Design a protein around this ligand. Structure first.
Ligand SMILES: NC(=O)C1=CN([C@@H]2O[C@H](COP(=O)(O)OP(=O)(O)OC[C@H]3O[C@@H](n4cnc5c(N)ncnc54)[C@H](OP(=O)(O)O)[C@@H]3O)[C@@H](O)[C@H]2O)C=CC1
Ligand SMILES: CC1(C)N=C(N)N=C(N)N1c1ccc(Cl)cc1
Ligand SMILES: [Co+2]
Length: 159
């Protein structure tokens, strides 16, 4: 099982300037619960976005994708191809935009948080992948985050 998990603005933006232009504690907790205990695969730029004092993310096999053969990610595995990372029963690809595009053919689940923030797409933004018509989606109700933004969870599946 390879799943993708991301939070997006309604427009599809997931990242800007190498970081994320929101933070919903409830989404962070949802992310932690879904990934805990499993492999998490991230692109090198997403690894770089984590402060050194919080990485590796605890309780998970942290894997970082890079073309740099000597890139060191203390507390993680660095691999040069996505396929090397998919050896555990449950693997979560946790971003960013480039890595979702590479991982989509291997994926059968997407856990998507939609953040009700009006954020038009800009050059250089990281975006959510486009899910075609092979994917079945299930939508939750809109909820209010303590951060002031509404959000809702989608669970997409395919065989
Ligand atoms: N809202 C959300 O849910 C999420 C948001 N984000 C945001 O997304 C942005 C980062 O996403 P993005 O900029 O797309 O970068 P990624 O996190 O996708 O990392 C890109 C890097 O991955 C490596 N890589 C890419 N393609 C390949 C390949 N074919 N083979 C080997 N290595 C490869 C390269 O590393 P190298 O350069 O070392 O070769 C490349 O620089 C940030 O803004 C981050 O905050 C991140 C995760 C989820
Ligand atoms: C916390 C956040 C934004 N939330 C969701 N739904 N999915 C992710 N992949 N996230 C994420 C987790 C870790 C990192 Cl480093 C970047 C984004
Ligand atoms: Co689990």
């Amino acid at each position: 099982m390879v799943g993708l998990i991301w939070a997006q603005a309604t427009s599809g933006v997931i990242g800007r300037g190498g970081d994320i232009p929101w933070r919903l504690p409830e989404d962070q907790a949802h992310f932690r619960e879904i990934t805990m205990g499993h492999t998490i695969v991230m692109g090198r730029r997403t690894w770089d976005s984590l402060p050194a004092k919080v990485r590796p993310l605890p309780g998970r096999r942290n894997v970082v994708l890079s073309r740099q053969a000597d890139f060191m990610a203390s507390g993680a595995e660095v691999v040069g191809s996505l396929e090397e990372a998919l050896t555990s029963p449950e693997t979560w690809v946790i971003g960013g935009g480039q890595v979702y595009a590479l991982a989509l053919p291997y994926a059968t689940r997407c856990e998507v948080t939609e953040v009700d923030i009006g954020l038009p797409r800009e050059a250089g933004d990281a975006l959510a992948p486009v899910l075609d018509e092979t994917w079945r989606g299930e939508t939750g109700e809109w909820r209010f985050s303590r951060s002031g933004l509404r959000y809702r969870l989608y669970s997409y599946h395919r065989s």
